[PDB]
């Protein structure tokens, strides 16, 4: 309540409790000043951007948290605790907090630099419960809370784009002030929380399949279906047209009929780990894989859930279908391809087409016999009745959910980084520091004051999530598959920090071991 | 304004101009009427189920945009394929990461809806 | 009618295949789909119907 | 009738996120590059509904 | 409303035979005797003054 | 000849919007004209001279 | 310095107009521009365009 | 009441209720 008084204590404990998981963390952040505590336009205006890469938009003083990624909330040993033993989870409820607020003034008179507390000056904060503002947490962008509870971050600012023609407003484009919802304004000594229920949502699957879409069979026991084996005939001594029909067995598995097809496809561009096996060309953009939207063509990342390679070769990848990460001290630009640890899907093949094959070949013309049967290659396939897919994997350092856009028709809502759709998601939650000017002038004047005093704070969130999870039954004589890690010596133990106190994840880690019946 | 009442009928199923036989044939007057005269009125209610709401709102911002300009993604994509490092052209990969700078370029959760081509006329 | 096909063998090549992990499977019978047009009965699909054996059917060819 | 005598209906507050009717969907690859084979694309003339896609119903009119 | 008599009081059958109609438009149906009331347009129930008292204030109806 | 009348009752869905600059609304233009729109004219005729759609208020996406 | 705070309530009159025609509406011009209508522009400066009368809806004197 | 705590919270919303419409606005 007071100055002398704490707001609330550290818990960064997580309990396992029953099939229920309570995961929670703690972390210190501050919070700067954003653009003078000026709303600006910006846009690609002097720029000279190509006509795929215009915008216009605003940016604001405000700044968010994100928790929205996993590795927020589970450390790697609860990750493997969690995806050796379970099939699956879902979140449940979520609690939030604020606490233990410093206003801090800066002072540069001298050339040094001085920094003194604060008691008066506050910092306002709201919650987006009714889903107004445009919702900016389901695009993967950096500024979320660490990974390791040791670190302190910097809240990234706020900001969004609306339509535009070029670099041009439309004037259908909206404008939005965010000073203009109710707000709590929190001094030190002043907490800030607020309770959030999950809809009912899927559980992620954790498993992977023991058998393959196409091997449903029973090898031992025949068909009593039959297919056309053969179109001609030997008998004349020279080939003449005669239909014969046999009955599908172990002898010819693919002849089969069959209950199900394979999931949709949208077909990618194939490259190698191996810099000798590609082509010299530049096709990165050019052979890229597009869609076309409003007279401008974006690129598809991740894209459809799809195989990233088939079962003899591990160095392909498709050239946008898979999720790429950073090793810890990456730079932005043009790193090589030692720098990043490329995610591999390879466990959802089972349904789930190659990303760079074809899906299949269709029949394209009628035959005579003046004419010869051709078939044709399907590069894109959508859904058609009777399809089964997976959908993509969740790892440690990928988004938990996305919001589903608000819409007149959707299919299959779940998103395509991966993770829980949501219709109505955890709220953002915006922040900002009180402006307080710096002395006024004794006449008056009715300009706006461009002279503030140079300000930041900081404090404490907490972050607790409920987790559900579906307990692992198998009935299956063999071990399973489980992540390991290696047990050989080694300079640096994975996942710990090193002598200079740097923390870095050496590779990423999927969800699915556990194996089960399709 | 006072308007026609229109006439009914309908179509079944045809090869050519000829009925299949498996057409169907319905008289009107085999189903349970009621009789008015001058002086009798007529008269019945009828309750929707439930439907959506037709949206009457149009979109602030496009399914390209939906970032936040200002950040940057954690995801890398490939932007180079070739260098131009030993007086020749020769095949590296290089991976980026994705800002305002690149706006098309970057990572996405969502699809546009689905396409059936048309061909463009001008007025 | 054995006269109107073609006398090349088709029976795999001509067929309509997916792709599943590297290996193609003949699709049978498939989405469900009509056999053949009003006029022409003795036409029908190479994968795409069902084909039950009469009483007493071998198994191969 | 003249196009004088008819009013056109113009669906385009609906290009956010329906594909615009005259373009194509998008580009798609081909085949597979090796180095003595250069990279191709082929344009989506038609797409079926796909895992992820969001669209907009058709406008109500008097 | 004004109802005429149709047919005559009798039920017909139509078809394209003896237009000449290509194969797109031949049809094969009955005509009756009967009448319907069609309400299913909007301006039948707003008026234009009513419509934009609904579109510009209304997200959904 | 008779009467007929129908009765709709519709559900509205109202709009909240936190947008600070003006919607896009639907207007009549001020200017002046021989013929008000969507009104007769001296021999009777109702005549409608665009059609209206429903979507102007804007939402975020 | 300090933060201040002002809440007034007000009473209306809704229209209720039997006119058949649309009214006129204040509305934002939809054709682009460098700069939306009552907004901020790039350098943070917030401008009014246009004075905005009370007065649009008609009513018989 | 005292140095640390809160003297308002920030409420800049309207609501447009029934007949009636509630309008309120805080600045610096």
Redesign the interface.
Known sequence: ???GNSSGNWHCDSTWMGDRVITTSTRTWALPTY??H???????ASTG?SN????F???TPWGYFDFNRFHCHFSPRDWQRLINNNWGFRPKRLNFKLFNIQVKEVTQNDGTTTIANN??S?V?V?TDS???????L??????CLPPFPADVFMV???????????S??????????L????????????NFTFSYTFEDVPFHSSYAHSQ???RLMNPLI?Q?????????TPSGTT?????????A?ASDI?????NW??G?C??????SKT??????????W?????????????????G??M?SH???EEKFFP??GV????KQGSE??????E??MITDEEEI??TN??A????????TNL???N?????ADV????????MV?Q?RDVYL?GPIW?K??????????????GGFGLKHPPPQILIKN????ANPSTTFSAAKFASFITQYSTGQVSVEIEWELQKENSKRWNPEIQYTSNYAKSANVDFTVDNNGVYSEPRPIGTRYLTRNL
Request: hydrophobic share 25%; aromatic share 12%.
């Open positions: 309540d007071g100055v653009n003078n000026l709303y600006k336009q910006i846009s690609s951007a795929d890469n215009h915008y938009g605003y940016s008691l008066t506050t306002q709201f009714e889903y107004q503002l445009p919702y900016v389901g695009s993967a962008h950096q500024g990234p600012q706020y900001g969004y784009l609306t339509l535009n023609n070029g041009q407003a439309v004037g259908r484009s909206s404008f939005y002030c000073e203009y919802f109710p707000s709590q304004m929190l001094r030190t000594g002043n393959s879409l196409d025949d009593y279906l039959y297919y056309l084996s053969r179109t001609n080939t003449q047209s005669r239909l014969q029909f046999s009955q067995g693919r002849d089969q009929s069959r097809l394979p949709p949208y077909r990618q561009q194939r490259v810099s000798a096996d590609n082509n010299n060309s530049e096709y990165s050019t052979g890229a894989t597009k869609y076309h939207l409003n007279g401008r063509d974006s690129l598809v990342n991740p459809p859930a195989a088939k079962d003899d050239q946008s999720l790429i990460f950073g932005k630009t043009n790193v090589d391809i720098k990043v093949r089972t087409p190659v760079t094959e074809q899906y299949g070949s269709v029949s035959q005579r016999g004419r010869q049967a051709a078939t590069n894109t396939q959508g859904v058609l009745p009777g897919w959908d350092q996305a589903i856009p608000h819409t007149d028709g959707h299919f299959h809502p779940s998103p395509l980084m009180t402006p307080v000017p």
